[PDB]
Each structure stands twice: as structure tokens, then as C-alpha cells.
């Protein structure tokens, strides 16, 4: 079975953990829809000596963007949401932006791929509480657009707060309630917004290093202003379920009524996993950014050279935490299409409670190891 | 030995824990300078399932006042502090105060016993960081006095922040460093100010109940504005050491003639006696039969009528912080001639209790536990 | 079996390793002269995935100073070295010095305890190879004194290479050969000077953190210019043997007259006593309570106040080298009449810790581990 | 399969390892573009008992020259570099030179085949760090030319530092980043410059024998003054990929619907033609061409040894030796119409022992694997 790739993956995890000095790390690897590995190293709570384990929940920062994109796709399929219309139809509160003396239009399709003119404020240590997304909009609504929309890519987090407001306006219900329903459908029974008052079991702590090269606690923050693009807590097992559901929907149309319908239509998944031009993927130079995901295509330019592998990932970095979720579909031959059943691929999710750690390469290597073994 | 009082005290702890619904509680009982019991029930961290244990650190709201009293007494003994001079001699920042048209004086001994006119603002959920007590003084400096100083008792917490500023001015060093030196001298190795950035091992979590009768986490707070009262974390074994040191300092004077090779107390016997004499025109909130000495609640010994209850002498202090409650109680024993001649101080029982639940009265339970352990003495 | 103590220590090691982010750590604990625990956590070589183990050899920085003081003590006992004569008798290469108005005398004993005027150059990343200590003396021989000798304490490392030159001059043999003889006598079969060319088995790698908070390799350095301080590599098992020998030499005289079949110590009881006596006007950086005895940090026993902290007597030394930290600590036990009458030396606990991470304070952790092992005893 | 040639090749590796007394050796053999064998014998770290394995990274000394020649060929194809103009057009820092009292000119193509007048300095145990090749040029810029350029061959390594400076000037970017892009394209994900500070996983140790015939560690050296020749750390699997890319580029021109080579077939054939008045050290039969020792195909007399055509390169660094060898197969009509490039065998060997010649062993292993083929 997989008794060889597990040791190699554990070695890789120990490598990254020693390189960044993370107090703890958690990994989950699922192959072909079955969870084959789930490991935890280190301590989730250094003060109370709580070990890391599969049940540990941690901050996921940018995976929230993919989770919100799922809601956007559901609204698009239901017909309540149009991507090409300007967002002022949904949100009159957002002012009609004008760039350099010419009226420009900001649309959902343009703003999902971070292609709008909204500038990147960066990490802000807000400790305030926001009740609804419309109130959260006041942080950046008055500010002008940095670029001309549709002309330049600029990674921004408040754009997905605007997307959450759009979800509230279109779905007719609260954004948090809609995402809770989506999580219940996807069986992600532990994914929940990051808030202080409720008792959330197996909640980890998030650390950083100070100027004396010592491990300390991160400052208290409230991610209410950005439940999208941040503010979500989950286990590795829930990210595995999310990735497996996404992969199944993508491959279901190709596979041929024993097969159940995919969460989203095959066309929706195809649209969601196509890279857009003039757009770059920060954590992988070979890939581009597509619909709240980063997509690397298959291409071999020259003979006997590097052949890229098609995969879709997303890395998130929150205050005192880092995470990655990566999906690697397998090559679909005629025989497997004839006799095998989707999903056919590998989903790897890695989360650590240490700031500014790049976990894309480790996830890619672990996925490649488990793909080598397959069987 | 104490195999009977332990079970009774554990039953009392279970009683109070089930009555208030506290997630966890920790108790420490020390008899005659030797720690004889240290127990923890429940969970210190409900989310991560961390059990309570003697090593758990929790918030002590009003014990900090007695800890600051230790520093003030040391400064008085060193001659650097005068209790009768007005506080403006030490801190010029504090404005002069006039009450219905006559100027009044705020003095150290008066503001210790909460007899000054500074009003009680109550608990304020501050999240701001304060560097020194001087900048912390801006929260209440401009407000006028509520009462005539020396005429009425009104429990207050910012008065001890003013006291911390006075300690900084008098000792010539930072208040936190002075208290660290004092804790090092007293062997309280886990007493530390409550701040978020450093890694403090065995830190507990503090809970409350919401309007739906469910357990929730308390809001994040920063207690830098009041390091002097409510600003410290400690274990039960550290409060036991503090109480044992205070008891030894209080009793060494009587026991001196018998051995004459006894180490001196941390403070002079006269200083401890002054510290544990209740002041008149003052009330003790958590015990009606006592008064409020210097940063302590003292219940005297007296029997007004024959065949009637006789008050037992003891000195306690209870505190309530956000999501936590605590008590520290010292019960000295009656000193016969035989024990003065043949025994060695301290002779008494110190009981400390800490629970991670808001607004819990642990004074009566501590007194009952102390009485159990006293009955089964030797 | 000291199981509870072992577990507590493992927890403490994990605590310090996580706090500093050290790739690997190795501990050795010896109780009453028998080696009771030896553990290694992490990786000695991160690139090649080599785990830490008791056989791992790491840089010991300032323990080399105690090892050199052993040689100086042997020369003192043999009568070949005078601690009061000026060093210019042994090393004419070192020039005579005048501090301000008057000429001054630098002696062996005054220079052992860092009380001379030699200023602290700090760590220099020198890659040049030195053959003999005389040519190593060229780095600081011309420079004047920073203070008047005997008037101020200043920690220095080049004082100990001057001591190595003194050892060569007095003994008449090479310093490395004399230290090799001493290591062979004490059964420290792994301790050796740190050099690149020879094949030293189980050699570890030493790491640091860069400006991007990533683990990187420390720059290549050559430690030939300071063999006496910072020039040696050893395991924890060798430091345990060294500490056991020192403790036995310290306690053999006390245990005399009872089962006096006792073998003599390596160093005379008077020599060990004067070795572990603190000197005044001198400080010990890694413990404020202690002072600096010759090549050692000594904390004496004292209780100023009743029911207050009582200081425990112990002798340690911590060292920090490029990419490595280490500590060696000796905690003797108090000698009652029964243990002197029946037991046999050594009676104490020795703890040695080495980690391949720069700027780590391991003194407090080692003291805590020693305290746990002393609690368990039996 | 190849279950017979593997045993013979292992025997040959044992022979060379025992003859030179190397602590460890690593081999990689790729047949027809697919890696068929990869083995490691001995210990990469004698002190810590770390065995040699296919993932071990070791120093490659003169294979860096071929890697740099790949960048030079890319610049040549892009039109940014002209070989025949004097190098002073690219690098004004290099002074104009007189030999025997007359002006002489040094060109890039003359400098590639070591035909220039730059003298051979040999191994220097430097420990200084150089930021860029421009300051690295100070080691040999002032010294006059030993021979008249174009008149006699002299193996020199600082000429490739000059070539790295030329690459920096011409490409408009740093030499290191250009080579990194080339490595990433070629799928050589383990090749990296040899530096001390960063953590390089599976880094080996390099040994030597002292005057007492005992194994000791080599002195610490810094190869920053020699990034272009030397100063590179790669596995055998990376050299296999490099050789496969070169062979495919060499053969795709002769061979439907195939992906193009990394370099044009004209560029590859220009790379693998020997230059006259030039000698190949590790094989007296062949000559030295464009950072590749090439042995041509020729039978002088009937019923006598026929020379087999191949291209190799050996390198010797402080405490390490390496060889990369490419043996193309003879292409008849059947293999042209029924097969896909690359057809041939690539053999790479690396050991951590100073002054070891591994060319003969690599050639023998390639010949064994060519015998079996199938």
C-alpha cells in the first residue's frame, strides 16, 4: 500500500518544520477519495503542552476565498447572480468608481480574479467586531482604485469582503448562514468562522518569533471584517472533503448512470479551473491564478525537458499561521474511464501555527510521492 | 495524619464547584509552614481538555493588593516612604483636590485602606497597552473625589495604581522590577504580571455564562492599567508561600525568647502588627464580622456573651477578575505558653483557592477547610 | 528508576527546544556517580537527517575554561606554578603593563577569575590556523588594559589563552598534550580540540537563524586562537565524568574516617575547596544569586529570612560558541551524619546539556532537571 | 531487461573504488532517455555514517563548463551574443592585450575551447566570497597572456569566469539567475551553486589522503570566484537529464510530430565538432570541443579497432571527482523510421575522492549497457 510514501512525506514535513521552526504542523493526504494519511507533529498549545493531532483546528486564510467562490458558483448556477453586471446593482452602498476621469465598472467576474483596481491594504490588526458585511465595507469603500480595472493584477483581501456582501445581497440570506449550509452539504462538520466567544474544541494557538529570536504569542486579532479571505477555522480532514468534492465535480462529466451528480455542474468547475491572462500565481511561478485558486497546466515545450503537471492549489497566511490545500488530478486513460470511478487524484492539506511559511512545495512533493505509489 | 480533613475539604470543593458551575478549581492547604494538600478538579482549558492541577496559573484580582502592600511596607521600613505626607510629594502629576470648597489632602495610609475619596469605576474592559503607571494615571486623575477623604470607605482599584506610581517614585526603580525582586525573595517563582505576548506555561482559560445558560469565553482584556490590583498570575503553591512568610513575620516576635536563633521575618514584627490591625469606619465585604486592615480583611477574636459564638481571628483576601475568582486565607492558632517555649513559627493554616469562573465567593469555603484542618491538627 | 524525573526533564527539554527553535538537544544526567539518563531530541545534521544521540559531539565553549583550570590546579599541586607571581616570569612575550599613572602586575590567580584588565574582544570569526599559544598571543599582547587589574570584573576569553601559554611555560610540555593526558586520566575518551582536518566521528553541525527567520549554517570558523576557552568538543557522557570526578574530589575529605578505603580524589580537598569558593567583586552572569569562583559559577547556601527562599548550593558553567550552546551543572547534596557514616562519595547530581543553536541559556533548565532528580532520589 | 549489465557495472565501480580508496561513489545510467540504473556504494559522510545514495549531491568541477556553454549557446541563438567580436565589447573591464609586442584579440569562441592566451592558474584554495563575476575578474585581469591567442591549447578555468561575466553583460541579468532558469527548464531541480550558508539537503563530504596514508577532511574552500567552472552541486539524476536533453537536441534533426530540442540542431552539431590543434586529456584519441571532449568515429585500418563516437567531460574538484558521458547509437534506416529520439546511453559517475579518473569506467559501463540494449 502507501507504507513507503508516508515515511518520505514525514521526512519532508520534518524538514519544513525544522527549517521554519514551527511549533507544530498537521498534514492530511487523501488518495482517490479515500483518506490514507493524517499526521500531527509538535504542539498545538506550547504553554499547555497540547500535542498536534488530526482533530486540531487552525486558521486558514486564503482557502476561505475558494470556499466563498463555491457560494458564488452556486448563486451563478441558481441564476440569481450575473458575473458581468457591475456590482452596484447588488451593492448600491459601493460608490460608482471613476478612474482618472473616466467612469469604470467593477464586476464580479473582474473582482474574483483580483483584477479590479482595489488596492492591497495588507495585514491590519483590527480588534473590532463587525455584525454585517455592509458595515465591514466602510474600511475601503471611500478609497479610490489604485489601477484601472481589468488592466493589472493586484492581490487584495477586501475584494472578497465585497464578494461576501454580494453573496448576502443575491442569496437573500446572511453570508455566514449560506456558508454554514454549504459546509453542511459538503460534510465539513468542523469548518467555522474564527470568533472568540464560542467554545471551539481542539482550538490551537498561533505563535511568532520576536526580535530576540524567541517564540512568543501573536497579538489578539478579530477577523470579522474579513470572514472571506480570512477568518475561518478548519481541520485538515475538512479541507480533504472540500478538495475531494471539487475534484469529483470536475471529473464526473468525463466519466461515463451509476455516478452521482457533482456538487457543481462540470461546466462550472471547468470555468473555475481555467487560468486568466495577465495574472500571476505567487506561490508557483509556472502557474496563473484562476477563480480563487492557483492553476498550473500541463505543457512540455521541448523534448527530454521538464513536463509540467496540472494541479490546483491555494496557500493562505494568517497572523501566526500558514496553510496550503493542493489538488493533483491524475491522468485519465481510456481504461480508468471505462472501469474506475471519480475522484481520481490526490488532495494534500498542510497547516502549521507559524507565520510566513511557504507550504506549497511540500504539498506538491507529498502529492507526487503518493502518486508514485498509487495502486 | 490529615486523611480525614482532606476528604471533607474535597467534598466542600465539589459543593462550591457544582453550585457555581465552575469548569475547574484548584486548592492549596499548608499547615504549620509545610504544604500538606494541593488538589485540582475539573478542566483548566475546556476546549483542549487540559485538567486543573497545582501547577495551573490563574488570575488573582485582589491578592495583588497585598503583594503591593509588601512593597509599600518594605519602602516604609527602608525610610524611603512616609505614610502621612500627601501623595503629591511623590507624584506631582496627581492634581490637588478641593471638596465643597475646602482643599483636602490625600495621604498614603488613607488611600491604602480605601478611605480616600477616589470613586469606584468598576471593571472596565480596556485593551490598551500601558508602559508605566504614570501614563496609566490619566484614566482617573482629572476626576474629582467622590467623598471626603478619611470620612467614608469605598473599595477602589485605581487607588492601588496610584500606590504603584508612588512605589516607582519612592524606590527609585520600576514597580514591576521591584515586585519581581520581592517575589524572588519570597520564593514565589511563578508569580508574574498578566500579559499576552510572553509564553507563560500552564496558563489557564477563564470562562463565563451567557444569557443562554451556556459556557463561553470571556472577552479579551488587558490589565496593564491596573498591575497593582488584578494584574498578576500565580499558582496556589505561591500564595501558600506568601501566606507562610506573612504568618512567620507576624508570629516570630512572640516566639523569640525561647530559641533566640530564629531567622528574622521578612518585615519587622511591628510592621506586620500594624498591617493586620483593622482600621475603624471600614467594612469587610466578604465577611461581615471583620474589618479591612492594610490590603487585608481581618476578623478579630471576641466573645460578647457567655455560651455564644466566639469570633475566630483570621486574615483573608478574596478577589474577582474577568472570568476568575480567588481567595487567600491565613488562620493563626492560639499561642499557649507551651507552644511559645517548645514550638517554632509559623503556627497556623494557609488556604488558597482559585477557580476559572466569574463572581464566585470562595471565602466561606476556605474558612471551612481551614477549620477542618485546624481541628485535625497534629 | 527515576521515571517521574526523567519525564519531567524531557518535558523541560522540549520546552526549551521549542522556545528557541533549536534543531537538536542532548542531555546527560548522572546521580551519585552512576549515569542514570542520556537523551537526544532532534537532528544533529539537518541536511543529512542525522538524529541527535548521546554519542553526538558538540562545541563546548566555556566548559573548556574549567578543563584548563584543572590543569592549572595540577600544576599548582605539583609546585610548578605560582598563582601570586606575575605572568612575565613564565611568559616574557607578554609585555609589562602600566595602567594610567602606575605600573601594574598581572598574576595567574588574578587572571583566572577574569579580574585583570584584559578587555573583552568578543567573538571574532577568525579562519587562520595557529600552531602554538605564543603566536596566538599576538592578537592582544600589544593592546593595553581596559581596567586596573584587581579592581573590576570583566569576562574575557583571551585571558585563558594567556593561561594556556602559562601552562605550556610552567609544565614544560605542549598545552594540548597536557590536556590530552588529563582527559585520558579522567576517562573522557571523546573530548578533543575542535579542528577540521581529522575525522571526528559523530561530529554535529551548528546552525543559526538569518534575517528572514530561516535556519542556516553558521560560517566556518577556526578556534585555534582560543584552545583554552572555546576550543573543545565532547559528548554529554564526558562532561558527566568530569563533573563526577570534581564532585568526588570535593567530598572525599568530608567522607574520611568512615569506610576510609576511599580512593583519593584527582585534586586535593584543599585544591577543590579553593576552586569552588566565590571571590568578591565578581559576578556570575547566568545566575544573579551566585558569584564567579575560579572557572566556575558558584551559588552558596543561605536563608536570610524565615519562611522565605533558601538558596541551594551548586556549581555550574555555561558556554556559548558559534552555533552552539552548552551547560554543565553540579548539585551536591547536603551531608547528614547518616550519609557520611554509611554512604560513599560522590553524593550529588550532575546535569550536562548541549544544543546546536546559538545564544541559548540552558542554566535554569539544568538546575530544574537537577532539582527534579533530587526530589525523586531513592 | 538489463539484469546482466548492472552486475558488470557494479563490479567495475567496486574496482575503481577499491583502486583509489574512495569512501563512496554514485552512478547513474540512462538508456534511450529513460533512467535504467542509479546506485550508490559507500558512505557520503564517513564521520556520521551516512551512506551514499542516488539523492546524494556532490561537487561537479568541469561539467559546470558544459552547463555554461548551454547558456552561451542560448544567447548565441537569441542573437544577443556574437562569438567573433572581441570580448572587450561586452566586458570593458578586461584590458586590451599585447603579445610579443603586437596587439592581439580574444574572442568568445576562442575562449570557449581554451584556445586563448589566458594562463592556467590551477587550483587555488580561496575562502573569500564574491558577489558578482565583475569583481571576480580581478584575480587574472592584469596578468598578461601566456600564449598568442588561437595558437596553442591550454586548459584554463578563469576563462570561464570571464565567460560568466560575458553572460552577465550580454543577457542583461545575473549569471546565477540565468543558469537557474536553464536548470528549471531542463528539470534539473537539484543542481545549485556550491555555497555554505544555505541548507542544501543530502550534501556530501569530500575527503583526501594525507602523508600518513590516512583519510582526512579536505580544507574549507569557497568557489565563488569560480561559479562558471566548478562551484556547482548536482546529483547523478540531474546530469542524466542534462545529457538526455543534449542528445535529444543533437538527434531530433535527423529524425513526424516531435517536440523541438532545447537548442537548434545546427547549434548542437556546432557544439559537438572537435576543434583542430586541441587535445583531450582524459582520452588521447579525441579532441576538445565546446566544453565537451568528443571522440569521433573512424577505423584507420581493416580488421582493427574502430573508434566509437562519444562525448564526455570529467571534472576534478577539491576532494571530489566526476564524469558525464554520452554515447549515441548508430542510426540505421529502421530506427529512424520506427523510433523516437533520444537513442543512446548517458552515464554519470561522482565520487568524493581527489584526483580520480572515471572516464574509462563510464565508457565501459556505457558499452555494457549498449551490448544488452533490447
Curated annotation (Swiss-Prot), chains B, C:
Active site: 62
Tissue occurrence: Expressed predominantly in skeletal muscle.
Any one GO CC term of the record: mitochondrion
Residue positions, PTM N6-acetyllysine: 129, 174
GO biological process: lipid metabolic process; proteolysis; regulation of lipid metabolic process
Recorded consequence of changing residue 301 to K: Does not affect serine protease activity; shows reduced tumor suppressor activity; shows reduced ability to down-regulate phosphatidylethanolamine (PtdEtn) levels
EC number: 3.4.-.-
Compartments where found: Mitochondrion
GO MF annotation terms: identical protein binding; peptidase activity
Keyword field contains Manganese: no
Source organism, top-level taxon: Eukaryota
Keywords: Acetylation, Hydrolase, Lipid metabolism, Mitochondrion, Protease, Transit peptide, Tumor suppressor
Main location group: mitochondrion
Factors inducing expression: Down-regulated in a number of cancer cells.
Family assignment from sequence similarity: Belongs to the peptidase S12 family.
Role noted for this protein: Mitochondrial serine protease that acts as a regulator of mitochondrial lipid metabolism. Acts by decreasing protein levels of PISD, a mitochondrial enzyme that converts phosphatidylserine (PtdSer) to phosphatidylethanolamine (PtdEtn), thereby affecting mitochondrial lipid metabolism. It is unclear whether it acts directly by mediating proteolysis of PISD or by mediating proteolysis of another lipid metabolism protein.
Protein name, per record: Serine beta-lactamase-like protein LACTB, mitochondrial
Source lineage: Eukaryota, Metazoa, Chordata, Craniata, Vertebrata
Gene that produces this protein: LACTB
Residues of the full protein shown: 103 to 546 of 547
